[PDB]
């Protein structure tokens, strides 16, 4: 139980280190923001 | 000229409608208008 608890606590700690050192990790959500922003700016530029 | 109120403006034949306000935009001495992504006017230099 001590070993399993320490491995769990360490593996949760590595998530913050991974996200803090991997800008591309959120790429699924940042691409959903970027696609909707690219679609709106394409629609606005078509007024010109 | 009237500010912070919605007005049916016309500067040098540039007809539109909007709330005119003073601005912090440093138009360089040769610049007469400023524009948005849509190719619509977004600021102007008052000709009077």
Curated annotation (Swiss-Prot), chain A:
Residues 1-48 are annotated as: Heptad repeat 1. It comes from the Viruses. Subunit of the fusion protein that is processed upon entry into the host cell. Mediates fusion of the virion and cellular membranes by functioning as a class I viral fusion protein. Contains a viral fusion peptide that is unmasked after S2 cleavage. This cleavage can occur at the cell membrane by host TMPRSS2 or during endocytosis by host CSTL. In either case, this triggers an extensive and irreversible conformational change that leads to fusion of the viral envelope with the cellular cytoplasmic membrane, releasing viral genomic RNA into the host cell cytoplasm. This is Spike protein S2'. The gene is S. The chain holds residues 920 to 967 of 1273 of the full protein.
Swiss-Prot record, chain B:
Changing residue 38 to D: In strain: Alpha/B.1.1.7. It comes from the Viruses. Attaches the virion to the cell membrane by interacting with host receptor, initiating the infection. The major receptor is host ACE2. When S2/S2' has been cleaved, binding to the receptor triggers direct fusion at the cell membrane. When S2/S2' has not been cleaved, binding to the receptor results in internalization of the virus by endocytosis using host TFRC and GRM2 and leading to fusion of the virion membrane with the host endosomal membrane. Alternatively, may use NRP1/NRP2 and integrin as entry receptors. Binds to host ACE2. RBD also interacts with the N-linked glycan on 'Asn-90' of ACE2. Cleavage of S generates a polybasic C-terminal sequence on S1 that binds to host Neuropilin-1 (NRP1) and Neuropilin-2 (NRP2) receptors. Interacts with host integrin alpha-5/beta-1 (ITGA5:ITGB1) and with ACE2 in complex with integrin alpha-5/beta-1 (ITGA5:ITGB1). May interact via cytoplasmic c-terminus with M protein. May interact (via N-terminus) with host bilirubin and biliverdin, thereby preventing antibody binding to the SARS-CoV-2 spike NTD via an allosteric mechanism. This is Spike protein S1.
